[PDB]
């Protein structure tokens, strides 16, 4: 394919922001994090644009690969604010893995009511995985509500996965 | 499809009661944790069944891709019991990852009666994940170290031996 | 299919990897040859496979020396030996090297997911250097690192935006 290819460059890209930001970190470098924080960014913004992209065009499998690409981008994203001190960060890399985690629940809902469990289930994985971001990134600031949220979203991808399991079981 | 879908909505069980057990882990709160091992516990008995299911008819992987969920189930299991101190579920999820290695023994070791290569090595590789997790469910009883290890060592010694065999074709 | 080599490899890497966490230093040792010994032989699997022409066994192969010498990395701080963070070191920057290749000769090819997926062994090489880097405090590889990095990341941003084109 030709949408595809983007998205594992994109992944590369979160990938080796994520080794320049550990290895920016312990010799306090800003110059490389100044990198490692925009790849990441951009990887989260062209995979915005290919999950909406993918969407639209009929391709729900598509978009929850770019979907994955938002986690992996604010999970790398959350290190880069952390590691700093940038509290400025920490709120943009949660907005962009709730969004991860607010769309797979709709291709959930769409997939679910066409019958297609199997599409179904790889949303509710990137269900859960937003929910682990989400949740990494309110221990280190201690903000209850995001912690709160990602329980929700975390139970909810958990109860769904449960109903999928007894509706093969017949 | 088929009951390999129970097994991929199970691995999500287990995906989603380790993030519920990362949070109340850290943020001191055992609803979550009774919740999350409640939840960890199920997928496990789920895949204990679909294993011998899949044992039966012929169907190897089925049994194989429940037994990875055992492992990754007690993973999740272990953890509660480190953080919240239980040292009975310990040793439930440590039963857990001791059944998936012995039980994958038998498909490893059956697979290579019937000269089929990798139907092997998929069991070889599940019986490694299991020695892992033992080993941080050790890492301290010194005789479950041995037997990580020892279960570590054979795995080890069988994928060389296999690869041998791969490599003259 | 040399695939069935190098997956059994893996597994050698594996359990080297569990033996090596739980330390007994025979057992460090026996991890130590057991990884070591998987890195020299997936290093035989990439160049037979990447001389008869398969560029993905030699790439898939490669990985195996990202993972046998991260797993080698860990015995040599454990072990307090600087002489073995040479062999996870000299074996992370030839799986770099080699890769980088692999993606010069997949990108005239056209092969623009094997070049992606030889790109990807390259960040996965550079972490391992990063590792490799900061435990002896040594910069001129913590710079090599990040430079391996920049590159893997700079050559796959173009892949990006020269796929799209035709989405």
């Known amino acids: 394919g030709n949408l595809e290819l983007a998205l ?8 080796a922001a994520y080794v320049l930001a550990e290895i ?5 470098n ?13 990887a989260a913004r062209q995979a915005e ?12 499998e598509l978009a929850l690969k770019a979907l994955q690409i938002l986690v992996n981008a604010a999970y790398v994203l959350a290190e880069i604010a952390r590691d700093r001190g940038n509290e400025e960060l920490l709120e943009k890399a949660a907005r962009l893995a709730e969004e ?4 797979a629940e709709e291709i959930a809902r769409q ?4 019958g297609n469990l ?18 990494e990134i309110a221990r280190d600031r201690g903000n209850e509500e ?25």
């Open 24 to 28: 920016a970190r312990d010799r306090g």
């Open 8 to 15: 594992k460059a994109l992944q590369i890209l979160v990938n």
């Open 30 to 42: 800003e110059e490389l994090l100044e990198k490692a924080a925009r790849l990441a960014e951009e």
């Open 49 to 60: 644009e290919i999950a909406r992209q993918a969407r639209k065009e009929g391709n729900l």
């Open 111 to 114: 997939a679910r009511k066409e």
């Open 118 to 135: 199997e599409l179904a289930l790889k949303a509710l994985q990137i269900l859960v995985n937003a929910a682990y971001v989400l949740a």
């Open 146 to 170: 995001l912690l709160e949220k990602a329980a929700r979203l975390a139970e909810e991808a958990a109860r769904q996965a449960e109903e999928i399991a007894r509706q093969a079981r017949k």
């Open 100 to 103: 991860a985690a607010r769309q």
